[PDB]
Symmetry: D2
Subunit: 299 residues, 4 copies
Amino acid sequence: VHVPHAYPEQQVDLGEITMNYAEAGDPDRPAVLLIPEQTGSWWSYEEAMGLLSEHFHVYAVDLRGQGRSSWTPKRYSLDNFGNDLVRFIALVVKRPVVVAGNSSGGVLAAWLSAYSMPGQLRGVLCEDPPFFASELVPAHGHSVRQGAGPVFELFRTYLGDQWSVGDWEGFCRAAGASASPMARSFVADGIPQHLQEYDPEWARVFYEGTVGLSCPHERMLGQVKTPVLLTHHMRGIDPETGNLLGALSDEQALRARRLMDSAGVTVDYESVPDASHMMHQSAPARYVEIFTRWAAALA
Amino acid sequence: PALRDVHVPHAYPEQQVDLGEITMNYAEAGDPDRPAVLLIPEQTGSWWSYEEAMGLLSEHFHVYAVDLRGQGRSSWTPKRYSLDNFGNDLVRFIALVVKRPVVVAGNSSGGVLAAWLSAYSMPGQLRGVLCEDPPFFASELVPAHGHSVRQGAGPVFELFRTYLGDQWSVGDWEGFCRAAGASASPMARSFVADGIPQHLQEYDPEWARVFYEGTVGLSCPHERMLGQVKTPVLLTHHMRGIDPETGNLLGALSDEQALRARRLMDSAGVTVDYESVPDASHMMHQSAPARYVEIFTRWAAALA
Amino acid sequence: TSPALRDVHVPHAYPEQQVDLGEITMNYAEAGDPDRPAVLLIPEQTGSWWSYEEAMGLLSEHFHVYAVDLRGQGRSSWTPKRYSLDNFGNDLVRFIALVVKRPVVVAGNSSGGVLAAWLSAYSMPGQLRGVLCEDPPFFASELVPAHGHSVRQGAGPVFELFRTYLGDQWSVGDWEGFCRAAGASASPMARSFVADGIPQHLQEYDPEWARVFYEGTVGLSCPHERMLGQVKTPVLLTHHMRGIDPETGNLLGALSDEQALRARRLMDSAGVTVDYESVPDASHMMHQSAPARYVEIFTRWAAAL
Amino acid sequence: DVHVPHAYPEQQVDLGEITMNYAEAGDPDRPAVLLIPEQTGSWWSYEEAMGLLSEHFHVYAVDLRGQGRSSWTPKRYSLDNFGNDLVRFIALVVKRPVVVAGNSSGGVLAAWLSAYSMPGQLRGVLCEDPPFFASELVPAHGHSVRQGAGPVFELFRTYLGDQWSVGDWEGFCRAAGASASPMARSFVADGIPQHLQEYDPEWARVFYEGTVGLSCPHERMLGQVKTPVLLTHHMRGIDPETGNLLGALSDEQALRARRLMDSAGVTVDYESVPDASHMMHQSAPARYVEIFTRWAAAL
């Protein structure tokens, strides 16, 4: 299923799983780790990796259940993703890292900041993170069922765990009829390449609230141990449904920022209301600029 | 309280009816020829929660006020507390005792059960329902609109579950008061008292468990309940607000949740009458009985 | 003509009618002289009222027989998000109060046999003379039973296949995918359902049924321990084929010998008369595979009542 | 607040989210061994055995999170989190291949490490009377936890409570003496045992509610082991009055565990000691140490 890409691909044995990834930049430059969004593979960062390879040693990784990394039925949880990335940092990077993650990847960047092995990290970028919005029963704001829940429901029903169903036509019919604008956005004639590399059990665990069941966001956010850059992209409310448009509300962002303040770290909050969910794709230069500014200030 | 030897006297005499699984305790007032009314109390509330309002309404109505299962002298039923079990209990009560079409008034939890009846009773049993400060969507763990119970009254339910326990099996009122006095929830700070209130002595705290854990209405989502109401609905909306410190709701339901609930009930095609009294306490039938009875009597007069 | 469209019902030997119970419409068939003792037949899961067709005939010569489609089945209402033991049971309570209007002898198969017991414990007073539980999955249909194997070691495999490949209200409807998955399954029951076309009874079936059993929500507020321990009418429990799949250890049949033992002990503690008829040579749906045997068993029992 | 003197000095190490307390015996000349206690069991559960083992092994006995002097972590008690804790401990303290040995819940974590640790971390594992499948809420084979140890877990959750928030030992004893579960009755005592004073009862909650193993089904674990295994099966039977399990796991559950582990391609040794207590390393130290040493020398 796997198509050619700009950078050569490598695979590492993290124990339970094998992780696919891709390197860029001069080795001696500072290390950067790029975590894709859900339904996103490492080559989600390609453009940005280019821009970033000028100054950093860039690693971009396929999480488990994505890309060419291992698919693990019944094993998708926040802690398993996070310890995957911890083992990657220790076995492959072998140096302190600045982590950047988009959406679910941003959630795992915060997870690393709070729960990585000591001194594994210098700072994390959380790019449009669904703090509390990706939870089934958050401590603040809307649940996943009022956010991206609908999209996940469609993935679970019509694609199935490990593409066991694979009813793409049914998926497009129901998605086009969804009141969720994001749901109606995922419609296409053929299956996008990124979804072909995606295990839809990801959707199941987010929709059903099991992925973070033992990793509540308030404790994560209250236990961060590194500087955090939080970018906050398009956001809004669908008047017809009340549902959250975007990754997280202003209220949820404020609560997350104040929890991270209680953890005693320094937070750079950059509201970019006009940016798309995946700014590293829609506007690679703007994203690399923000990241580089914040990164220079560390250590 | 766990021995259930706490019954005390009241203004009206008390009757009991076998409904099948449970026995329901209840009180009755007014001329039996008058239009029938069914009063459903709030959680932790017994029938006598309506005593005062029964004394006014009785002058114009045949009033029945009930103890739901797990409250008062009605049966306590471990592992059996769901919205459908409460509702079908009330259906059987209407069929076996009232034997007339009723107008139903419910407060908080009862108001939700009132809407339940409006949607799910046997045909013809109801002429209309009053939902008094109902936690529409705010009592669900995963509501379709707005904020979950965990961001509302879930803190107090958690205290009840941990420190009082199913059927008062723990009964650590000292630990409960200690934790309640230190809660960010003001509603929890309300319950702190030197002695256990009579209404809490008659209350089975497994109630609190099933609401806090999301099991009580798991098979009865509020979106569909409200989208299938079948009688005129009178929804009163009392004090609501936001604790600036927590972002957790104060009061029964948020403005957004009231809005979406009204939209659902209108899609059901019923006449919805929204009466907003932001200065009113949660149990207006107890704190301002005259005002409550006036509102109810005016709306009920227009029913038929 | 699609199971999702609910336009697949076919003619049958007995007249059908629908009653408004308030949330749902319940479809039902009637047979026999309306003055003879009343009887209520509850089908099995994926079973419609005409699951009893043949038995109805034999029984209608001595009983006024009602046979019902439960919600989520046949021509009764399909109610998304509303499928639970208590809702099924209260539908049947309503049906007895509104249609039969006389005390009834209830007989239910499998899931229906679990609802017969439900009624015996939780119905309105005086509604029932006795109940016949035909191969009921006591404890084996629960996700976390007090005794014996869970539904995941019983019928769960086939329920998972229904949920995944048919979907709520036939929203997925991938019959060929279901057949491929079922034929490769290690559950013999699951393999049984493979067929060239979709069987008629399954066309009338809301597979959300399967979901609520597979996920353990259908009986969450109705633990079988409490139900069985609060029966208030005489109960006849028939126990058909049962065994253990050696490759898996999973239950073959409706319930295990141990689970039937514990259920009988519970019911005996309730103070009711309990009859136990172990018929190890009988299929799960004895009322279909051996109608005359079934009617003999039922007739003796009901005449004692 | 309650820790008392023991036969060995205690050490602590920061694993990144938690602080793990532990004790050490024997010499670095000798091969590394990692002892994992049972639930409610602290490191000193192994004290006597440690002595014997220190004759020929460098021994590490650990406090798991929520036990002893290790960090208490509310809402974070999952098998994956315990397991990644022990992976971190092996990586940061032992820094050597280790022969792991765990008892009861500890045996389950030993299996977890065999299947899911970082590559090359382990040489083999001894699962001592492990509750394979019988500690799960919905096991793929045999009794569930609710027909096993679940009754005592429910008593712990209702009367001791999260982080000893309730602490009603009188009520615990009243309920335990009236328990139909004989193990529940075995926990009745005048005062609170020292091992239970260092124990966080949220442990009991997450086993009773089935959250701890939700994302770690035992069938996948056992089918993906990667080291030689030694499984010891102690006392087991059935309570006639309830049908409930006596012991860690049934004969059927042991049979299925072994079939899975053998399907994984490892060397599985099965040692049935039907007359042994649950904590044989405590009740018969020399017997336990003989069995362990006899097996570990083959590695």
